[PDB]
């Protein structure tokens, strides 16, 4: 039970981090538009 719990919680945390790495890049992409303007 505890090995599954540790493995489950570890997977969710990685999904959260990967899910937010897109924002740091997507938000960066739109942020670069100000430099051109």
């Amino acid at each position: 039970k505890r090995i599954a719990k540790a493995k489950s919680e570890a997977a969710d945390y990685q999904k959260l981090l990967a899910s937010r790495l897109k924002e740091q890049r997507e938000r960066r992409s739109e942020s670069l538009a100000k430099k051109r303007s």
Binding site: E9, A10, D12, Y13, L16, L17, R20
Partner: protein, 261 residues
């Protein structure tokens, strides 16, 4: 001493317990637990001195040994268990549920809760750091440790903790403009809006809080506890709502009460 002291003389007990000086030579020595001994309310005080369910030290043991009292959702049988700020005390037989909050005079008040609001509590984040295997974790000021916290949570933030799932439901960042309560010192129990943060390298950080009536008071960062984002707290406050009245104003109310009552 050659070790640990197991007794608390009655005159050395915290004043906010409001123990009578001639009631005996000793006061309940708070057990080790989530809260500090000087910033807690042992269950014996709650059951006997505040709620009057027990008349003696012995009767408190009978109540607790029947497993009738729960703190933060778990049954507690220790008479001197240190229940503290934001703790939820539940007594299923009486259908009662209280939250330990300070009144504006700095003393713990058993604020009756609704069944819906008794399913969570607020905790202040102490620190966030990497644990074994590089796994991040955060610990609070109520002794709790939460692994895999949201990366946005930082020290001094407040987290909403669900007592059933035992997980972080939501959190508030510590920043100017939020409503906070003072949990220590002269201004303990006062609620206001965090207006300013004065940092001093190597020294304590001072925070200037402004009451809803414009009264401004300062205190140390360690005595602040964010209650909500913006101006609305996430928890129900007692009648005073953290508004500290002057003695002149308080005497004015007492005089009027006798005229009406």
């Amino acid at each position: 001493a050659r070790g640990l002291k197991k007794h608390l003389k009655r005159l050395n007990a915290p004043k906010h317990w409001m123990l009578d000086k001639l009631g005996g030579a000793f006061a309940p020595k708070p057990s080790s637990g989530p809260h500090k001994s000087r910033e807690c309310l042992p269950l014996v005080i709650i059951l006997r001195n505040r709620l009057k369910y027990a008349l003696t030290y012995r009767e408190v043991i009978s109540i607790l040994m029947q497993r009738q009292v729960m703190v933060d959702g778990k049954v507690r049988t220790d008479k001197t268990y240190p229940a503290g700020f934001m703790d939820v005390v539940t007594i299923p037989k009486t259908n009662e549920s209280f939250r330990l909050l300070y009144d504006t005079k700095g003393r713990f008040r058993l604020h009756s809760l609704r069944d819906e609001e008794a399913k969570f509590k607020l905790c202040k984040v102490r620190s966030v750091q990497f644990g074994q295997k590089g796994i991040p974790y955060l610990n609070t000021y109520d002794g709790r440790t939460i692994r895999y916290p949201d990366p946005l949570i930082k020290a001094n933030d407040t987290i909403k903790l669900d007592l059933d799932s035992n997980k972080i439901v939501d959190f508030i960042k510590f920043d100017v403009g939020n409503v906070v309560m003072v949990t220590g010192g002269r201004n303990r129990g006062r609620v206001g809006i965090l207006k300013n943060r004065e940092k001093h390298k190597g020294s304590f950080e001072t925070v200037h809080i402004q009451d809803s009536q414009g009264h401004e008071f300062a205190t140390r960062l360690g005595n602040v506890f964010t209650l909500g984002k913006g101006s609305k707290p996430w928890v129900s406050l007692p009648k005073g709502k953290g508004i500290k009245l002057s003695i002149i104003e308080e005497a004015r109310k007492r005089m009027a009460a006798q005229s009406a009552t």
